[PDB]
Amino acid sequence: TPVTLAKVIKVLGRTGSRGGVTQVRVEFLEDTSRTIVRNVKGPVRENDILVLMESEREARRLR
Amino acid sequence: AVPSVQTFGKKKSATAVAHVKAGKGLIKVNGSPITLVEPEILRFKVYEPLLLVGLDKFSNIDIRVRVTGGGHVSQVYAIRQAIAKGLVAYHQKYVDEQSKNELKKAFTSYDRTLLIADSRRPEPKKFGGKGARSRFQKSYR
Amino acid sequence: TPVVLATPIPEEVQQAQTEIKLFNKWSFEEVEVKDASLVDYVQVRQPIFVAHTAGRYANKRFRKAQCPIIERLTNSLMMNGRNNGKKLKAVRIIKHTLDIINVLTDQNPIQVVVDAITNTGPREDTTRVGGGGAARRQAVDVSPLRRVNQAIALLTIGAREAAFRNIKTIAETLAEELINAAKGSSTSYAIKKKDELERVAKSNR
Amino acid sequence: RRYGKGSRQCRVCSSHTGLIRKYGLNICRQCFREKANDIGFNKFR
Amino acid sequence: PGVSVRDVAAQDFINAYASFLQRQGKLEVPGYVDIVKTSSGNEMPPQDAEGWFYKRAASVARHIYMRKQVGVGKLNKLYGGAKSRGVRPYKHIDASGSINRKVLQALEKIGIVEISPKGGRRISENGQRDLDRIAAQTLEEDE
Amino acid sequence: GRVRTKTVKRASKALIERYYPKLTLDFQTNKRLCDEIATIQSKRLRNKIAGYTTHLMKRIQKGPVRG
Amino acid sequence: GQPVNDFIDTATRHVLMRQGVLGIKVKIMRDPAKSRTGPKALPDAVTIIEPKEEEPILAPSVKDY
Amino acid sequence: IKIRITLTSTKVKQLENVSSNIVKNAEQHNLVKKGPVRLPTKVLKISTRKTPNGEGSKTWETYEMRIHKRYIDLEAPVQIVKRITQITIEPGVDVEVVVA
RNA sequence: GAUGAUG
RNA sequence: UAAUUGCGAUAACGAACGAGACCUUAACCUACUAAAUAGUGGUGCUAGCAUUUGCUGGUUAUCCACUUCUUAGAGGGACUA
RNA sequence: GACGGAGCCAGCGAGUCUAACCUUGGCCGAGAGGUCUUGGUAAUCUUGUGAAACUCCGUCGUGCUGGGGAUAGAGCAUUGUAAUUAUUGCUCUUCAACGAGGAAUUCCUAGUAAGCGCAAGUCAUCAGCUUGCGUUGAUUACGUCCCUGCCCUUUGUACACACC
C-alpha cells in the first residue's frame, strides 16, 4: 500500500494517562495546505517528518 | 638554549606531560615510539592530532611525553591532549599568531577534547547503597 | 608525497591525511540513505576513525542524534550484565562485522548498516489506554528519533540471542542480521518483529 | 588476657563492646560522639 | 640509527629472545618444569610445557632493562592473578616464589643480570649487549 | 530557578537610591564599586547584589521602574 | 547553618530530683557586633554607606601653586 | 649550623602567625633559610552510626580532624638560634627543632 | 461513570 | 520559583524561626609567596646501539638553575554576565 | 566464554611504650610458609601499594563439556593456653543442583546504573558485611497524574482513640 509523508508544524501538548503520547499538527509534503492533527509515540520537535500509514485519520484528545 | 615548551593534559586521574623543542621529528611516549602505544585498537586516537594537520608541521620538532595515573584508556586521552596542546603553545611563542589560530580551528572543529579538558569527575558514594545514587534493596515482609 | 621523520609513521597510516576512513578502510562520502524522514537523525557527515569518542550526549534532550551512527550501534552491544562496559570488545566486534559485510556483498559496509536501520524502525505502534483500570490498545504514530532507537535495539538483540549457545561468533550473527534486514528479508529477527508491531497497530485503529 | 575482647575496655565507661581503636582512641562509639568536639573531631562533610 | 629494546613491541621481543635462548641451550632449567604450576592462583600448569620457562626468562630480562632494580617479591606481585576461591569472590594472589628465584639465579649464571647496591638484581653491561643485539634482528625480520 | 531573594532585591534597591550617578551598566565596574560602598560577607552574595543592580540599571534607561 | 557554630553556645545537665532525673539545656546567641575575633555580623547582613551631599559648582575654575 | 624547625597544628590561622614570625625575624638578622615548606594535609576520619542502640534507618556519620605540618631550615649562629627557639610559643601549635 | 467486605 | 522564592494584590501594618545566605569537598589559574621529605632541565661520572651535534638508561654524595606537572598559604573567577 | 603464556595501568588509606606494627631485599621450600638482614614513629620507607576487569597470542569447540565447584577422603602449614562441632591458607582426590528462572517485587536519569578489584572499621586468627576509593563505562525520558503517596485551596461529614 502507498505511504504518505507529513511535516510537524506545531506541537500542541501531551496526552495519554502517563504522557507518552505527544500531540502534533502536520502539513503534507505533496499536496501541501492540508493539515491534520494526530498523536505520536516518541520525542518530537518542529520540522520533523513523520511517515503516516493512513492519511485521513484525525486523532482524538483525552481532554 | 633551543626553543622549548611544556604542556599537559588530563582525563580522570591520568596526566601526561609533553616537552616540545625544535628538532628532527621525534615523537616518543614513555621512552618508546608513538607506534607502539597500547591498547592497540586505540592507536588512531594518538595519531589523530598528527594526521589532522599533516605530518609536515611535526618535522622540525621533537615531542617527548610521559603518562601517569588513571588507567589504560584514560591515559591515551591524556596523551592526545598533550600533543595537541604542545603544538599550539609552540606556535604561540615561536612562529606567529595566525598559525596558532588556524591550527586551533582545525583541532576544535573535529574534537574539542583535543585542547580543552573534560570537566566530568566522579560522584562520592553515599551510605545506604553501593554507589552515589543506587541503594540497597528494600523489603516489606 | 610521503614524509619521513625521526620516528617513522608506516605508509599504511599516512594516506589518511587526505580523507578519514573508519578503521582506516571505509569511507564516508558515499554513504547516503533515501528515507527522507530520517536524514536529520542518522549522523554520517562527520567522519571518525575508531568509533570510541567518549562524548557527552546525555545532558540535553536531543544531543544523542548528533552521535555518529557507528558509535550508537557499538554502544548497544555492551549489554546483559557481564558485558556492561567493555567498549573495547564492542569496537572489535564492529571492526570484524563491518569487514564481513564487505566480503559477503561487495558493497560499502557502512551503507549496509544504514539500510538496516531504515528498514526496521516501526512506523505505527500501540499504547495502553483505559479508564478506571479497564484498558485496551490504540494505534499511534512513531517519531523519527524513536525509529532509529528501536531499530538499533532490535538489530542487536536478535544478533545477541542468535549467537548465544551457538558455534557462530557474535560478529557473524550480527553480520548476518544486518545483511538480511537491509535486504528486506523475513529471515531477519528485526524485520519479522517490525511486521508484528505494525500488524497489531492496524487491527487496533 | 594478653588479647581479645577482654583485654580492651572503653576508657570512659568500662564498656566492652563498640570500642574504636583507630589512632589509639580506645573510646566506645557512644562516648566518642559525646566527646568528639573536645577531642578535636568536627563534622564537616 | 641505532636500536634499543624500547623500539620493538613487547610481544615480538619476548618470543625472539626466548627462542634464541632455547637454541643456545646453556640456560639452566630447574628440572621440575613438568610438575610445578606458575602460581597458587592457577589451576593448570603451563600449556607450552616445553618452552614456558624460556618465555619467563625473556620477560624478566626485558623487565630489568626498563627499570633500575627488582626483587623476587616484585615479580610475584607482577605475576599474580585472580584466585577463583569458588563460591567466594576473587582476590589477588601472588605467584610462585621458587620459580622466580631460580630464573634470576639462572640469569646470573649466564651473565645477563647482577646483584646491585640497594638490593635486588640489575642489568649488566653484558646483559644490555645481548638484548640490544636481538632487538635489531627482530626489526630486520619485518619483511 | 534563578529567582532572587529579598536580601538581594533590597540590597540592590538600597544602592541605586543612593548611588545612581556612580553606578554604570558594567558588571565589572559595579562589582568593584560595591566593595567600597557596602560591607558584604561573601564573594557570592556580592556578585549577586551587583548583578541585580546592573539589571535594574538597564530597566531605568527604558523608563521609570516602579518603586 | 554555619553561623550556629560561631554565635551559639550550648550546654546540658542532669538534675537528680527525688521524683527522678530531669534535664536542662541552655542556649545563648551572643551578639555578633561584639565579636572580637571572627565575623562581625551574620552572613546576610548588608550595610550601605550614606554618601555626603555634593552641590553643583557655579562655573569652571583653576588653582595655581 | 644547620637546623630544621617543624610545626604541626590543627588550625592554620595560629600556625601562620608563628611561621610568618619566624621568616620575618630571620630576614632582619639576614640569616640564610629555606622557605616554609607546606607538606600535604593529612586528615583523620572516624565513621560511626548515630544511633546508640541499633534501631532505625541505617544512618552513618563522619568526623574529621586535620593536621597541617610545615618546616623551615636555618643556618644561623647559636646565640640567635637560642632566642628563636624560645619565642613564638602559642597554644594549639607544636614545634620541634633539630640540629644537624 | 468496570470491581473494592471487615477490624 | 527547587522553595510562604519572588512580582503583585490587599483590613492590615512592622517583625521573628524555617528555605536562601553560610561551611566542607570536587572542577580552572603557564598570575603572587616558596619548596628536593615533590617534581623537571642542564652539567660533572658512566653502560649499550650507531657513531655528524643521534636514541634510551644508570649515578639521591656532583653541583647549578627553574616551578609546566605535585603540594599548601593568600587571592582571582560565574553574576545565568 | 573457561584455561595457559605474555602485555601492563589507579585513587582514598594505615603502620612500632608502658611496645611489638607496616615490611623491601637475600636464601630454602610445589605451596602455604620458614630463616637472616634492612628502611619507616613517615610527601623520606613498605608503596609506581607493578590490584582486578581488561587488551594480544595461543589450547579447547556447543558435549551438565576444559561451564559449575557444592557436598566428601587423605596429607602439609600459620594464629592461639586450647581449634574436637573441620578458625583460616596450601596440595591431590570426590565433581551434586543449576540449561536464564511462576505468581510477585527492588534500585536507578550520567562519569550516574552495571562489570572489576583495593585500603580502612571489627581483628591474635577469621569478610561472602559495612564505610570510602578509584579503573572500564551504555541503553532510555527531559514527561504525566493511571497505580503508590506528598504540599496548597474550595467542599460534605452522624469522624476527635480522628477511615485501621
Side-chain angles (χ1 to χ4, degrees), chain B residues 10-40:
Chain B
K10 332 196 110 188
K11 174 163 193 303
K12 292 142 155 272
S13 70
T15 206
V17 175
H19 308 261
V20 185
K21 87 193 45 43
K24 313 138 263 152
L26 216 71
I27 300 150
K28 315 221 101 63
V29 299
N30 261 4
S32 160
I34 186 175
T35 282
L36 293 185
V37 176
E38 291 164 344
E40 185 206 337

Side-chain angles (χ1 to χ4, degrees), chain E residues 11 37-38 42 56 67 85 92 96 101-102 121:
Chain E
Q11 184 159 249
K37 61 178 181 176
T38 58
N42 295 113
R56 169 58 57 82
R67 340 201 200 182
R85 275 144 56 63
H92 169 82
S96 188
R101 207 210 333 274
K102 288 199 154 92
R121 262 79 172 192

Side-chain angles (χ1 to χ4, degrees), chain F residues 4-65:
Chain F
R4 265 150 294 216
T5 48
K6 60 196 162 74
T7 170
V8 175
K9 303 268 184 183
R10 297 218 261 271
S12 323
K13 186 274 301 190
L15 282 160
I16 284 200
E17 73 186 350
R18 285 162 236 281
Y19 289 95
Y20 180 86
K22 287 210 142 329
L23 289 162
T24 165
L25 314 185
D26 205 296
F27 175 84
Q28 313 296 0
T29 303
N30 270 339
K31 174 174 64 180
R32 291 284 170 229
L33 205 141
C34 292
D35 291 318
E36 293 227 55
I37 303 304
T39 308
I40 302 158
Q41 306 296 347
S42 54
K43 293 195 321 202
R44 176 127 165 251
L45 180 55
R46 178 200 100 230
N47 284 358
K48 298 184 164 187
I49 272 182
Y52 195 60
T53 297
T54 304
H55 171 73
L56 293 164
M57 264 321 174
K58 288 186 200 275
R59 298 258 305 288
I60 291 166
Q61 303 303 63
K62 248 187 66 41
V65 299

Side-chain angles (χ1 to χ4, degrees), chain E residues 72-102:
Chain E
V72 299
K74 253 86 181 193
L75 284 299
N76 292 358
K77 190 80 160 280
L78 169 133
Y79 289 120
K83 185 103 175 23
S84 165
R85 275 144 56 63
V87 159
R88 305 185 281 210
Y90 298 74
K91 197 172 32 57
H92 169 82
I93 281 313
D94 318 74
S96 188
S98 147
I99 299 192
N100 264 114
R101 207 210 333 274
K102 288 199 154 92

Side-chain angles (χ1 to χ4, degrees), chain H residues 30-87:
Chain H
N30 303 305
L31 311 168
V32 70
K33 58 173 172 63
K34 277 279 192 288
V37 178
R38 313 188 200 265
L39 297 160
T41 307
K42 54 183 56 34
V43 297
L44 293 72
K45 301 171 191 271
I46 294 280
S47 303
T48 279
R49 297 272 305 242
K50 295 230 253 283
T51 166
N53 69 253
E55 184 273 16
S57 76
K58 321 288 174 65
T59 279
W60 281 79
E61 180 179 71
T62 178
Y63 294 86
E64 313 205 353
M65 173 171 129
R66 302 175 180 195
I67 314 202
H68 308 260
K69 189 198 270 193
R70 303 186 175 112
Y71 68 66
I72 298 157
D73 286 56
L74 291 317
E75 156 56 70
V78 164
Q79 73 268 8
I80 175 54
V81 171
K82 186 180 288 182
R83 66 193 295 173
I84 284 284
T85 302
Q86 191 265 355
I87 60 168

Side-chain angles (χ1 to χ4, degrees), chain C residues 21-199:
Chain C
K21 300 194 163 126
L22 171 61
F23 293 122
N24 205 19
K25 268 191 73 23
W26 318 118
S27 52
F28 284 92
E29 181 49 293
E30 299 294 337
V31 180
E32 293 86 347
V33 170
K34 299 180 178 178
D35 196 343
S37 72
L38 298 177
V39 169
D40 311 325
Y41 289 86
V42 175
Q43 163 70 288
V44 286
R45 305 289 65 151
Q46 265 64 33
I48 53 139
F49 284 110
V50 72
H52 185 296
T53 325
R56 308 215 274 310
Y57 304 109
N59 282 345
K60 263 280 307 308
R61 191 175 178 200
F62 285 104
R63 202 165 281 276
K64 90 217 279 173
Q66 263 148 331
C67 185
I69 198 65
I70 277 288
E71 176 107 35
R72 258 155 64 74
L73 177 68
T74 301
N75 283 350
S76 195
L77 296 171
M78 338 164 61
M79 296 235 68
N80 282 95
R82 71 193 208 231
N83 307 265
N84 283 347
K86 307 189 180 2
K87 195 154 169 171
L88 299 181
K89 312 177 86 81
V91 183
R92 193 65 82 181
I93 291 161
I94 278 194
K95 165 157 165 39
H96 300 343
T97 281
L98 293 147
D99 230 327
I100 298 161
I101 293 204
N102 178 33
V103 182
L104 257 295
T105 286
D106 299 346
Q107 181 177 344
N108 185 334
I110 303 173
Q111 170 62 334
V112 172
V113 174
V114 187
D115 282 338
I117 284 169
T118 87
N119 287 358
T120 312
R123 291 90 81 70
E124 259 192 358
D125 256 25
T126 81
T127 279
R128 278 157 295 178
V129 66
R136 59 173 298 174
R137 321 291 316 231
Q138 183 65 244
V140 289
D141 316 314
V142 183
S143 192
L145 173 52
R146 198 196 162 86
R147 293 227 288 129
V148 183
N149 292 347
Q150 199 159 348
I152 294 167
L154 283 170
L155 294 169
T156 41
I157 288 282
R160 172 155 46 248
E161 243 176 67
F164 178 78
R165 249 192 254 120
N166 208 326
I167 184 59
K168 313 172 44 60
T169 177
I170 181 58
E172 285 169 12
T173 62
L174 200 142
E176 287 173 4
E177 181 66 11
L178 294 198
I179 291 165
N180 287 324
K183 197 158 56 223
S185 180
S186 300
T187 304
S188 149
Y189 177 99
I191 290 292
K192 224 186 202 42
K193 224 71 156 174
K194 199 174 79 67
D195 288 358
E196 204 194 82
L197 283 96
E198 304 188 298
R199 179 185 92 61

